[PDB]
Amino acid sequence: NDAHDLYFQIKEMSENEKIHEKVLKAALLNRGAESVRRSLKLKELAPQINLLYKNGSIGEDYWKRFETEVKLIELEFKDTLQEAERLQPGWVQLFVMVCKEICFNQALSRRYQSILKRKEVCIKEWELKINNDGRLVN
Amino acid sequence: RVDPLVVLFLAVGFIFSVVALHVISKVAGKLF
Amino acid sequence: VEFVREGTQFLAKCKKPDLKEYTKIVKAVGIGFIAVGIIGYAIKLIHIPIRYVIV
Amino acid sequence: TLEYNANSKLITASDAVVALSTETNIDQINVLTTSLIGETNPNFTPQPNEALSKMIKGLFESGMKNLQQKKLNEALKNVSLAIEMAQRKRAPWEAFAIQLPELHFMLRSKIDLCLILGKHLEALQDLDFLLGTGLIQPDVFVRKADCLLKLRQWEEARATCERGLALAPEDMKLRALLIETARNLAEYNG
Amino acid sequence: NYEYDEASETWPSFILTGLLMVVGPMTLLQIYQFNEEVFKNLNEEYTSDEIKQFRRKFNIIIIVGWILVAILLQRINSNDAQSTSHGIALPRFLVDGSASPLLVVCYVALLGLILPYFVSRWWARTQSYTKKGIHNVTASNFVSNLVNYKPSEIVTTDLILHWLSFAHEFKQFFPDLQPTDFEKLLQDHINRRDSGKLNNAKFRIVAKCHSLLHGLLDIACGFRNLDIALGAINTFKCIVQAVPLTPNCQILQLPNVDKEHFITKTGDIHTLGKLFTLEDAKIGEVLGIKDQAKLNETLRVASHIPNLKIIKADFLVPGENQVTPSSTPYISLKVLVRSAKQPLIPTSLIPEENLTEPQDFESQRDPFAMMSKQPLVPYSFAPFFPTKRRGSWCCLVSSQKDGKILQTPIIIEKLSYKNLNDDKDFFDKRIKMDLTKHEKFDINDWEIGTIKIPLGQPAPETVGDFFFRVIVKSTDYFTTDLDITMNMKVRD
Amino acid sequence: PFESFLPEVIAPERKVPYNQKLIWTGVSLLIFLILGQIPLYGIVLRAMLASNRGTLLELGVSPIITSSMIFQFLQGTQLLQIRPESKQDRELFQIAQKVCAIILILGQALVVVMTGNYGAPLPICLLLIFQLMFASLIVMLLDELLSKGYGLGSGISLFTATNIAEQIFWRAFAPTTVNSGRGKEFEGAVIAFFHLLAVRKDKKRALVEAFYRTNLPNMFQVLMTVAIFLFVLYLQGFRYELPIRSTKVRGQIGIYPIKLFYTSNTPIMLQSALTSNIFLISQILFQKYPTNPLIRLIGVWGIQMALSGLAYYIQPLMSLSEALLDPIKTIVYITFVLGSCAVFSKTWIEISGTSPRDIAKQFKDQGMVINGKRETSIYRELKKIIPTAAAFGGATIGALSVGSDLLGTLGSGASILMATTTIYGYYEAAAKEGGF
């Protein structure tokens, strides 16, 4: 469940089928945005996990697993940034802010796209009788 | 550094080693 | 004799245990005492014939 | 697996069934590629565009013009097209603090128009999105409780009125909404 | 050196004393050795046989000791019988006969094999479960489910059933089935459908879901998430009552109704108060059962489930008269367990004596002792749940500035249902004759329960009004719950 | 300060529940009890059943106790200059404990194996050293384990209480017999009671014959020790609870209990140590010089109980017969032991930093006050409470010891008091914390 391996798949496809050059940049920016999002998520989730662990409600192995993922994310981000350096000369100072912005933009886009599916679950749950034009017919 | 099970195993191992040394010496003295 | 008077004055203001609490106290402490004593006595008794046979 | 088109330069997964994460990621990559093909400079800056903003503002003004002319049907259509164009033809790397307030400002007018027209579920979902994306104001809970009363959900309406009064206790409309909600709920239980 | 028993003259007395010191006290102790429950009888009259059979399927030491004592005493009486000579009471063949290596080999076995193996087993078994009462893999799965949870996705009952179907405790029971099979069995239970052959597994997992849902609620409150907590409570209600969540569910949870008639005929009766508004025979004609001996049972069930109502609620601090910055207050609720049939009694009629807090050091040192003295809640009416459950109310507090649960939920179990008894049957809603001025109405007879919730966080260091939100939901029925807002006026 | 990589048990990252705690305590106790019953290998009635001499537990906990007391004395005399403001000097002191204990174990094992009666003639000596070293290190690790958080409390107290209870039970249910002319008689009280009741077939005579038993333990001592145990258990619940309230964070109300046994078994221990030391010194001095005016004055040892000496005057009374024999000795010894206990308790509370001044300082530091009194009077209120409590607790402990030694129980009052206090500590901790 990640966009990490999809970039590698596109890369192996490019090494054989001669795809365009901007698709690589697109996949790279997507991987960078996902890494930034996951880093912020872990930074915001750490204290709650710590409290659940101290209270004795989560176990002993999950804490070590979380602490390992904390640095695995940093390693992944460093590798992504090195690859960004390799792909374009002198594109490391701006890549970070570009990813920092596309993260929020695509999160907002997904949140706005979800309302079309959110609108029918409430109909099914509340047993609404909606005709055309969105009006109610009791 | 050391777990409780390690301490229990060390204790039981030392005890059984002493007892086995005793019984081995006794049987060796009895046979020859 | 004043020392005994102060001692009794202090003992008056104390909080002696009632029957319902004293019952729990004696039950728990007696259970612990018997639990340690029986274990010690059994370990002391079992090892006499073993120490005869081995040594 | 995933196949790569040649003339359109769009990636599509040719598998029989795919997960949701893979599909949304392929869609995001397609959006980024379609933006990069259009934007010329290799070192693109997060600075927003100009012609796109001009077109969006023109569409929104053409939609707002119909309110003065008292046509409440095509105004909503023009506002919806403006919002759709803003969400579609805008690159992802543009400034977020400039991309969000325009969406809020257009969605507020779309909400007002949908509420005046008679559609309550679409307005309720727009209010819910606008409130969950980081806008909490007493002018939101009033309309949300209004919709929840219009489509007969009284516990949620009472909770919304209470949370609205817990932010601006000096409001004069939330109190009337709370009175009406309490009356409807007392008739509902008794 | 010791001298072991050579003629069997000393060990009988020792064994006799050892047997007496164990037999005597056991025989002595063997010689030495508030809430009305109305559904305990009506529950066993509606439970199907397939659940009765499931719930059915899933002193000699004193006598033998006395016989051994008699045998030992007979053997003792049948016997014939200067420097010190010490001796031991144990017999001689135990140490000098052909059974001399047997003792040491049994000792070395019981010391080297049975002790470490059993201790390691106990340690590995006690180190795998969580303090709440669920497995470690189950808690890991719940945490991993709540970590990557998209806030755009709306929570329902199907989502939480899908989350529950991945519990590791379901795999230990039946290592052959798959999580899809568990989800299918849960859907079949909720929708009141027949499984055919896996009923004994369906009942098992459904009875197990209790601890899993409690742990999920705990974790969801730990992650400061309100929608998932509310969904978990609603799913617990649905699992207990065996009914899917719909708008008109308080009236479908009743024992014997037919949905195909009630749903299609009437469309305005959604609660139990609206139902008891109607007459006695109109209720039967609406619910479509037309059987008096069968209508009385459903009318006895519909008028004995508890609904709550507040009388007074505020923040209290022990030993003071107001809330000051950085103090430790708690919540004090005065609720009134009422029936869906009784009219409303005004708050002014309460004599104000039951609402005031006592001011004494023994009472303000621990303010929960008076709450811990109420009777337990009776057994609930759930004919479809396999086991037998007691009622419960899960109360959780959140904030109004952002809307996040800020503490783990408190679960109360002691409350008085005195207002639901049958002696106060004059207090009916359909009489409409101002029953407060009645010959049998004495406002000192109605009991007012209390609920106290520790806050777990001190008051803020600033000065102002800070609003909260308290929710007290049940976990068995679909009754009327509490949802109130209150503010602490930090005044300094 | 230095760097040392020594084996040590790590504390649990989370609080251990009560069941695991109890099970670990029981397992450690069983291991310790089994370790002390197995004899050594190379060494050449029982002669090894009474004391732990000739077993793997020769040294036992003695080096641990000596290191503890020497470093406690060094801390009390204020030469380490410990400061609780840092979290490194505490670990330095903790590792000093161990680096002293290990070298003391080595030295004591060397001395015992080179001077003791095991034998002067290399491999056998190496094995005899390694056995004792390994056993002492195991005991130290086990104590550290029980103290780190896996056990109900300390290890030394548990081991001492277990030894006391084991002695009390072995004095009553001993299966061993003794044949001296008349016949075989059980060395226990209950065992011999049932035996004489069953086999003698003369019940009226056997009852008196087994109830008194001038030569061996009897049933009267069992009844007396049960009564004294119950009384001591009753006097443990006494406590003075004064009400306190907080001023920093309002709404914190509680009580501060001031027990009766405030010093908790220390003054009687000091008195016993002093009496044993002075008796041994007088005995050695009388042994060295046969007759001298001062030596004849201090004590005249004879058949070992001295006569017409100060050691005789401070010699304990074993039974009521000795008390009725000389009233002056009793009327001096009772007052002497009671006054010594009271004075020792007062000096101990004054020295150990539990004086009312230090309690008032802690109250001022935490911010608490007394409920119905002012802020500037906490010291004046504790002065009227704590000293009397300590003095009367010492006097009561002394009186209990005297009565227990007089009524002739199966165990001295000091040992029963120590065991009861140790077990009541665990009970009170489990009740306050909350656990099965």
Side-chain angles (χ1 to χ4, degrees), chain A residues 1-14 16 18-53 55-68 70-87 89-137, chain B residues 1-2 4-29, chain C, chain D residues 1-2 4-69 71-101 103-138 140-171 173-190, chain E residues 1-8 10-32 34-39 41-43 46-48 51-56 59-79 81 83-95 97-152 154-182 184-259 261-278 280-284 286-296 298-359 361 363-421 423-441 443-460 463-464 466-491, chain F residues 1 4 6-7 9-44 47-50 53-82 84 86 89 93-116 118-200 203-278 280-295 297-404 406-436:
Chain A
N1 45 9
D2 42 7
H4 159 77
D5 54 357
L6 208 152
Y7 168 52
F8 281 149
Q9 196 162 3
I10 298 182
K11 193 176 181 179
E12 314 295 352
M13 175 195 309
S14 63
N16 301 6
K18 178 50 213 71
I19 79 177
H20 208 189
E21 57 176 353
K22 292 179 176 297
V23 192
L24 282 175
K25 291 190 179 64
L28 188 51
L29 292 159
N30 195 7
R31 174 161 72 152
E34 184 62 36
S35 46
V36 171
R37 201 264 298 173
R38 294 195 176 190
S39 88
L40 300 188
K41 183 73 172 181
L42 293 181
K43 191 172 305 176
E44 183 254 320
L45 281 181
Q48 302 156 3
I49 300 286
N50 224 317
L51 177 56
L52 277 169
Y53 170 64
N55 287 339
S57 158
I58 196 168
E60 196 39 80
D61 189 4
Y62 194 87
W63 182 236
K64 317 292 184 180
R65 180 183 174 183
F66 183 83
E67 294 197 49
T68 299
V70 162
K71 65 195 63 174
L72 280 183
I73 293 303
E74 201 50 33
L75 268 44
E76 174 58 72
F77 184 68
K78 266 150 60 203
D79 181 2
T80 300
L81 190 61
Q82 164 189 357
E83 181 71 21
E85 174 54 90
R86 198 269 294 173
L87 200 150
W91 199 42
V92 188
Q93 176 51 15
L94 191 62
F95 180 84
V96 192
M97 44 189 302
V98 170
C99 308
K100 184 65 65 67
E101 296 196 13
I102 66 181
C103 174
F104 296 128
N105 279 19
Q106 70 190 20
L108 171 72
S109 199
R110 285 177 306 185
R111 180 56 180 92
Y112 178 74
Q113 290 287 342
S114 157
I115 70 177
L116 176 46
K117 176 263 302 173
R118 198 183 186 94
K119 184 181 304 179
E120 62 189 20
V121 176
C122 68
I123 285 186
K124 184 205 67 177
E125 272 273 340
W126 303 342
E127 298 177 354
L128 259 65
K129 299 294 188 291
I130 294 192
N131 73 325
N132 282 177
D133 316 328
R135 289 178 175 82
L136 282 177
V137 296
Chain B
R1 167 170 171 80
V2 178
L5 266 294
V6 194
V7 193
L8 178 137
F9 291 156
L10 259 57
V12 184
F14 175 57
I15 286 172
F16 167 73
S17 87
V18 172
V19 175
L21 198 53
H22 267 157
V23 69
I24 288 285
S25 168
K26 183 258 289 181
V27 172
Chain C
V1 76
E2 178 65 32
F3 161 68
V4 177
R5 181 175 292 172
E6 314 166 29
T8 317
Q9 279 284 350
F10 171 79
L11 277 178
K13 306 296 176 299
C14 277
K15 180 183 178 176
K16 298 92 183 179
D18 52 299
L19 193 63
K20 304 302 281 153
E21 181 179 1
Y22 179 77
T23 294
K24 290 192 299 297
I25 282 185
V26 60
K27 178 184 300 183
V29 177
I31 283 300
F33 210 83
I34 291 180
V36 296
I38 291 300
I39 288 176
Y41 167 80
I43 296 301
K44 196 166 186 176
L45 167 64
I46 287 181
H47 276 265
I48 295 183
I50 302 177
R51 213 191 304 118
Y52 195 110
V53 166
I54 294 183
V55 179
Chain D
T1 186
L2 73 170
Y4 158 80
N5 202 332
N7 55 336
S8 158
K9 309 174 186 178
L10 266 42
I11 282 174
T12 43
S14 60
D15 214 18
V17 70
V18 303
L20 291 155
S21 88
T22 296
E23 193 51 83
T24 179
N25 285 279
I26 293 175
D27 282 358
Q28 292 170 357
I29 293 176
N30 285 278
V31 168
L32 282 168
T33 304
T34 42
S35 279
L36 280 176
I37 289 290
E39 195 267 359
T40 77
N41 187 270
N43 301 274
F44 42 83
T45 174
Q47 176 185 3
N49 207 19
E50 194 42 47
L52 172 80
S53 291
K54 172 71 224 83
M55 300 206 328
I56 294 170
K57 187 45 65 165
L59 264 188
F60 187 75
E61 290 315 276
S62 159
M64 282 315 267
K65 172 50 180 304
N66 298 320
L67 281 181
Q68 274 96 62
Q69 197 214 79
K71 192 181 316 310
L72 271 64
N73 283 270
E74 279 75 0
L76 180 55
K77 185 194 53 53
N78 289 23
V79 172
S80 46
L81 269 70
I83 301 184
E84 202 194 29
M85 191 168 71
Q87 266 293 95
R88 212 64 56 180
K89 298 183 182 180
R90 185 156 287 263
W93 54 73
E94 297 191 0
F96 178 52
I98 301 165
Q99 196 165 358
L100 182 58
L103 187 65
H104 277 323
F105 170 75
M106 292 181 300
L107 211 59
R108 200 170 302 164
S109 279
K110 179 188 178 181
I111 278 169
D112 284 18
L113 194 40
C114 285
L115 204 55
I116 293 180
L117 200 54
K119 318 176 186 304
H120 286 104
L121 190 55
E122 187 171 10
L124 170 59
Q125 289 309 318
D126 295 5
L127 270 302
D128 216 356
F129 159 74
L130 185 140
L131 191 150
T133 191
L135 199 155
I136 50 171
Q137 287 183 357
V140 172
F141 301 98
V142 171
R143 311 212 195 104
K144 197 178 179 185
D146 186 16
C147 315
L148 289 170
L149 283 181
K150 281 297 179 178
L151 51 89
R152 298 195 295 268
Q153 304 291 323
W154 289 299
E155 305 291 336
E156 301 215 350
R158 183 170 52 85
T160 297
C161 294
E162 286 181 351
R163 198 200 176 191
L165 283 170
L167 302 185
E170 294 99 21
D171 206 322
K173 313 187 66 177
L174 284 168
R175 297 178 180 175
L177 265 70
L178 189 59
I179 291 298
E180 208 187 61
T181 300
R183 179 248 295 181
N184 281 323
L185 195 141
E187 205 276 346
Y188 170 68
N189 278 318
Chain E
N1 195 227
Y2 275 142
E3 171 166 30
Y4 285 73
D5 192 349
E6 185 67 27
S8 278
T10 44
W11 67 268
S13 167
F14 173 55
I15 303 296
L16 186 144
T17 302
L19 261 173
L20 278 188
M21 293 302 300
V22 185
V23 162
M26 272 166 150
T27 298
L28 201 43
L29 72 87
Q30 284 289 344
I31 291 299
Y32 167 75
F34 203 77
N35 213 337
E36 161 174 334
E37 305 183 357
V38 284
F39 293 142
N41 186 2
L42 209 57
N43 200 337
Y46 281 91
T47 310
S48 68
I51 316 180
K52 289 172 178 294
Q53 296 174 359
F54 167 80
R55 211 186 299 121
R56 168 199 311 167
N59 191 270
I60 67 184
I61 64 154
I62 286 184
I63 303 300
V64 72
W66 276 108
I67 310 304
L68 258 52
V69 158
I71 295 165
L72 282 183
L73 197 149
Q74 189 267 348
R75 181 179 174 90
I76 288 180
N77 262 327
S78 78
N79 261 357
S83 48
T84 186
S85 48
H86 287 50
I88 189 76
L90 306 181
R92 178 65 177 181
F93 59 83
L94 194 62
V95 187
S98 159
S100 65
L102 177 64
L103 182 64
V104 66
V105 75
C106 169
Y107 165 75
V108 76
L110 190 148
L111 179 67
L113 270 44
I114 295 188
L115 172 65
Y117 173 75
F118 270 61
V119 165
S120 316
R121 268 187 63 257
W122 163 87
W123 187 236
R125 177 179 62 90
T126 196
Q127 207 72 8
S128 84
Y129 271 61
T130 298
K131 175 160 319 193
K132 178 59 61 181
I134 61 181
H135 209 277
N136 272 329
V137 186
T138 303
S140 177
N141 284 329
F142 286 158
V143 172
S144 162
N145 277 331
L146 270 79
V147 158
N148 44 33
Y149 160 72
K150 296 297 175 295
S152 77
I154 178 173
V155 62
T156 45
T157 310
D158 306 359
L159 183 141
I160 294 193
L161 293 187
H162 183 93
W163 285 5
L164 280 185
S165 88
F166 282 88
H168 188 77
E169 303 170 348
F170 290 174
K171 186 61 66 178
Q172 305 171 354
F173 297 167
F174 320 99
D176 305 358
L177 276 69
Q178 292 293 333
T180 53
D181 303 319
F182 298 147
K184 178 217 168 192
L185 294 182
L186 286 167
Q187 297 282 147
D188 280 357
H189 162 56
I190 282 178
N191 281 259
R192 288 175 178 175
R193 211 179 297 107
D194 191 14
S195 279
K197 197 184 58 179
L198 305 96
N199 293 348
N200 303 273
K202 174 175 69 175
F203 299 146
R204 188 65 179 276
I205 63 177
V206 164
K208 191 58 177 182
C209 273
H210 170 280
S211 297
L212 298 179
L213 274 174
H214 265 62
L216 171 58
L217 174 65
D218 185 295
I219 294 183
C221 287
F223 269 163
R224 311 173 82 256
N225 205 332
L226 181 72
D227 313 298
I228 295 185
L230 266 53
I233 300 181
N234 292 325
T235 300
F236 199 84
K237 292 182 175 187
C238 305
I239 285 174
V240 167
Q241 290 300 313
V243 57
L245 191 150
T246 58
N248 43 17
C249 172
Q250 321 192 10
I251 199 177
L252 284 185
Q253 76 185 338
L254 295 188
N256 42 13
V257 306
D258 51 337
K259 314 174 182 182
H261 175 79
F262 166 73
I263 294 182
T264 72
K265 283 331 181 283
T266 81
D268 42 18
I269 318 295
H270 285 66
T271 41
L272 282 175
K274 196 73 171 183
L275 181 66
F276 278 110
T277 295
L278 293 169
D280 203 337
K282 183 63 65 67
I283 286 174
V286 160
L287 263 50
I289 61 171
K290 55 185 179 302
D291 188 8
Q292 203 68 27
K294 195 165 294 301
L295 183 54
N296 296 336
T298 185
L299 289 187
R300 189 175 209 276
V301 177
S303 88
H304 272 248
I305 71 177
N307 301 350
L308 288 181
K309 192 192 193 69
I310 44 163
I311 305 298
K312 188 190 62 58
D314 48 1
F315 285 91
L316 291 182
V317 54
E320 214 180 341
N321 302 155
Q322 64 178 8
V323 180
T324 51
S326 186
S327 47
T328 67
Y330 63 98
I331 307 184
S332 177
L333 308 162
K334 294 293 174 181
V335 298
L336 171 81
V337 169
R338 57 180 291 275
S339 177
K341 191 186 54 179
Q342 302 156 344
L344 60 90
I345 53 173
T347 311
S348 88
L349 290 182
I350 310 301
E352 179 60 12
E353 312 308 344
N354 298 115
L355 302 173
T356 295
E357 273 279 343
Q359 293 288 272
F361 193 91
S363 298
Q364 75 196 31
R365 185 173 59 90
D366 54 345
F368 313 116
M370 73 166 319
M371 181 185 60
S372 162
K373 281 162 37 60
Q374 293 177 287
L376 279 171
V377 293
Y379 277 130
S380 55
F381 177 74
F384 295 92
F385 203 66
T387 68
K388 278 190 165 58
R389 289 193 77 255
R390 284 193 179 276
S392 195
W393 308 80
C394 185
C395 61
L396 54 91
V397 58
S398 73
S399 159
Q400 296 284 70
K401 168 167 284 302
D402 43 1
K404 308 291 186 56
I405 296 185
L406 54 88
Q407 76 183 67
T408 54
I410 308 297
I411 294 179
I412 84 172
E413 191 174 1
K414 302 190 180 61
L415 215 65
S416 177
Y417 291 12
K418 182 184 176 183
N419 311 271
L420 300 165
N421 288 4
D423 52 286
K424 35 183 65 74
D425 272 8
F426 69 101
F427 205 62
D428 192 358
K429 189 151 56 189
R430 292 148 290 187
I431 317 294
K432 56 174 58 183
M433 190 250 287
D434 182 3
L435 302 184
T436 42
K437 272 77 179 181
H438 207 57
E439 279 58 31
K440 310 173 187 177
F441 189 69
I443 201 55
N444 294 280
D445 261 357
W446 299 76
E447 190 170 0
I448 295 181
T450 186
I451 301 177
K452 301 192 186 309
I453 307 172
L455 216 62
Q457 290 190 5
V463 171
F466 304 86
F467 295 85
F468 292 84
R469 174 186 177 186
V470 188
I471 311 171
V472 179
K473 303 266 291 303
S474 178
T475 57
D476 291 3
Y477 304 93
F478 282 91
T479 60
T480 291
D481 301 306
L482 286 183
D483 180 316
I484 57 183
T485 177
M486 60 177 67
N487 62 327
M488 51 160 61
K489 311 188 192 64
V490 186
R491 208 49 61 186
Chain F
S4 282
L6 306 181
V9 179
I10 43 164
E13 271 196 319
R14 316 185 305 181
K15 168 240 171 182
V16 178
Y18 189 79
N19 315 336
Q20 313 181 18
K21 204 163 300 184
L22 181 53
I23 295 300
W24 279 124
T25 290
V27 161
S28 289
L29 182 58
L30 177 66
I31 291 303
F32 174 83
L33 291 192
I34 294 184
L35 197 64
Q37 296 286 330
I38 298 186
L40 294 95
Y41 172 72
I43 61 177
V44 68
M48 66 157 296
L49 176 48
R53 189 181 191 274
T55 64
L56 306 184
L57 216 57
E58 268 279 357
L59 278 77
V61 292
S62 303
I64 293 91
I65 311 185
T66 70
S67 290
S68 157
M69 62 188 44
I70 182 175
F71 276 168
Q72 195 275 338
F73 162 75
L74 258 54
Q75 171 202 129
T77 178
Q78 203 57 287
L79 272 71
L80 273 296
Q81 313 116 330
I82 317 167
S86 45
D89 68 299
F93 186 76
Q94 209 295 325
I95 203 76
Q97 299 287 118
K98 191 172 306 179
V99 64
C100 166
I102 296 185
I103 66 154
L104 200 146
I105 289 178
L106 256 171
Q108 203 155 358
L110 269 192
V111 167
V112 162
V113 76
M114 290 296 329
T115 305
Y118 299 152
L122 300 104
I124 296 305
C125 273
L126 162 64
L127 205 56
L128 261 61
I129 297 192
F130 171 71
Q131 287 185 346
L132 309 173
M133 288 210 272
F134 207 80
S136 279
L137 289 203
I138 285 183
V139 171
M140 192 179 65
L141 290 190
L142 197 63
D143 180 2
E144 209 165 49
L145 172 139
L146 286 182
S147 299
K148 274 307 179 183
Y150 298 89
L152 297 171
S154 199
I156 309 302
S157 315
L158 178 64
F159 300 152
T160 318
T162 297
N163 287 336
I164 290 172
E166 171 196 74
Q167 291 176 3
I168 289 294
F169 263 73
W170 185 265
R171 290 281 296 278
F173 295 105
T176 71
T177 72
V178 163
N179 180 23
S180 69
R182 289 179 293 272
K184 285 197 169 300
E185 313 163 351
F186 277 95
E187 263 182 337
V190 177
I191 310 280
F193 174 70
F194 279 116
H195 178 66
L196 261 65
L197 192 65
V199 63
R200 183 162 297 268
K203 328 298 173 182
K204 180 57 186 58
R205 172 184 53 184
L207 217 58
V208 176
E209 173 187 0
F211 200 83
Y212 293 161
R213 294 185 73 198
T214 301
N215 48 17
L216 282 175
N218 57 4
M219 190 70 61
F220 190 86
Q221 303 185 0
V222 179
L223 264 45
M224 288 299 108
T225 189
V226 167
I228 288 187
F229 178 81
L230 295 184
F231 193 55
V232 164
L233 261 186
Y234 172 68
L235 269 74
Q236 291 276 6
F238 281 57
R239 57 198 177 275
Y240 191 101
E241 293 174 337
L242 77 163
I244 63 179
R245 58 161 61 250
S246 160
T247 42
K248 304 299 181 181
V249 300
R250 304 180 179 272
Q252 284 199 1
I253 316 293
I255 55 178
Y256 186 70
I258 300 172
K259 301 187 174 184
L260 177 69
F261 290 160
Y262 200 72
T263 48
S264 198
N265 199 38
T266 302
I268 195 186
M269 192 183 336
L270 301 153
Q271 182 262 337
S272 87
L274 171 139
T275 43
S276 88
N277 272 26
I278 189 184
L280 186 153
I281 282 299
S282 197
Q283 198 149 15
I284 288 298
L285 162 73
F286 194 88
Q287 188 271 344
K288 185 188 183 300
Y289 263 104
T291 192
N292 285 101
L294 262 183
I295 288 87
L297 194 140
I298 175 177
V300 194
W301 291 83
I303 179 59
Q304 287 297 326
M305 170 269 269
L307 192 64
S308 198
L310 212 63
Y312 170 75
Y313 289 165
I314 74 177
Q315 198 77 299
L317 303 168
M318 283 319 309
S319 198
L320 282 74
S321 77
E322 305 185 11
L324 268 294
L325 172 148
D326 191 11
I328 299 301
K329 172 173 175 50
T330 82
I331 201 66
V332 168
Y333 171 73
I334 290 178
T335 76
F336 161 77
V337 63
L338 294 190
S340 159
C341 285
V343 168
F344 282 154
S345 158
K346 278 185 178 177
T347 304
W348 193 257
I349 72 164
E350 295 293 327
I351 284 303
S352 165
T354 315
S355 173
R357 186 172 302 269
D358 183 277
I359 302 301
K361 177 262 280 193
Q362 289 187 190
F363 273 19
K364 173 178 297 298
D365 189 349
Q366 299 191 242
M368 317 296 295
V369 296
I370 301 187
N371 187 279
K373 292 170 183 60
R374 302 172 179 86
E375 168 61 79
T376 77
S377 299
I378 317 167
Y379 176 71
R380 194 161 56 186
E381 295 304 339
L382 294 169
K383 266 187 54 182
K384 265 69 181 181
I385 296 175
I386 290 174
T388 313
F392 214 82
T396 315
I397 289 178
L400 275 175
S401 164
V402 167
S404 158
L406 203 78
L407 284 182
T409 43
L410 292 180
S412 159
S415 43
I416 306 180
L417 258 172
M418 171 184 328
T420 43
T421 297
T422 307
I423 303 175
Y424 189 86
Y426 302 160
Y427 159 74
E428 188 175 13
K432 185 174 65 36
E433 167 208 349
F436 296 93

